[PDB]
Amino acid sequence: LEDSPQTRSLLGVFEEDATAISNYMNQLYQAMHRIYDAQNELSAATHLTSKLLKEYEKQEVMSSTLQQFSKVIDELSSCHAVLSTQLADAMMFPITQFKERDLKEILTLKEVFQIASNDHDAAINRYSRLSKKRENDKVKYEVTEDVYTSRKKQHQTMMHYFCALNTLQYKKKIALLEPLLGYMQAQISFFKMGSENLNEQLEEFLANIGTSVQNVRREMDSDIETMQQTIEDLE
Template sequence: MPAVDKLLLEEALQDSPQTRSLLSVFEEDAGTLTDYTNQLLQAMQRVYGAQNEMCLATQQLSKQLLAYEKQNFALGKGDEEVISTLHYFSKVVDELNVLHTELAKQLADTMVLPIIQFREKDLTEVSTLKDLFGLASNEHDLSMAKYSRLPKKKENEKVKTDVVKEVAAARRKQHLSSLQYYCALNALQYRKRVAMMEPMIGFAHGQSRNGRGCREAECREEKKSATFYNSTRVLGRLGGSVG
């Protein structure tokens, strides 16, 4: 089947088999998009949950590093440098915790929220209009069936007039609902492109900012680690010499 950009609104009134066939293609596409969006949201929520867990984990790690000096070690002599270094690492972890917390908020605002809004607004709108279009079509079919069963006798002219009015009203309602439904399906084809890209742009931007902050903290930590490592090596050699 050749690629089709949109449903033609002027064909909504005709309601031909060809139009119905094309409509079914757009409906199938919308259904596939809905399923995919739900799965994508689950994956994004999992990433957001993992980021929140990282916030809690770094917070706990920082507290545990500070708890070292409160331990009642039987052989605690010479732990001053260990304590001061762990205090420094605790501050570094606190800085990382701030970065992870900011990233979690960014992921919630720029990744998870847009896809939720797309699902709740655009996809729900299409689903609602589909139901309304189906109801209007059924009402139109019922009114047409009622009209086809009318007797041909003249004494039933008033009944016929009432049924004709009913058919006309049902046709107007169906036409209006089809126009709204077609417009929503057409718009969905364009909105889905933005909806799929926007959350990942937010994800990439947040990770980039967080990465720069983490690298700065890691550089400071590496310098402190090197200083502590060198000092412990010297102390180790001195201890060996004394032995």
């Protein structure tokens, strides 16, 4: 990449690609952010539900059954809370930093280059203006010098910008794969830990509660017939 024409040409392609990269990563940032918010809210609601079950007693066999449910639910809420903090740290942080630091840096340097470029166009236009007239040896030297200094400035800001565009090609891949790896690793711990808490003893408990429920339903139907009898007698 020997000269300015070629580099400027390649800069345009890197810039168009950086625009597509920004559009896709912003969409990914938004989707992941919805996952993060939902998992955070799900942890809080699951912990609130376990908290409420404990508060039942603050109005006894039911009390105790609710305590066991509350204990299992609190274990699952811990899984959800650890997953939330790992999603924030290993998934949200990387995609957020790519958007807030890298993509912003690209726009900033693009603008610094735009201004240095406007400044050089002004010097070239002023050179054209002063070329059309008989004038000072001094202003001639100055207008020429301004072309050189404004072009050097334009070139330097262009390369600062092109270097970041080139590095963006790498950050793009890292910022795509890092949050996905972080997300997946956190899910593996969450499903494994949760799944172990949900054992065969817990299933025995659930089967028995199921039976307790069917029994209450039967007793209800039977006591409704007594109460209807009691109503007729009182009438």
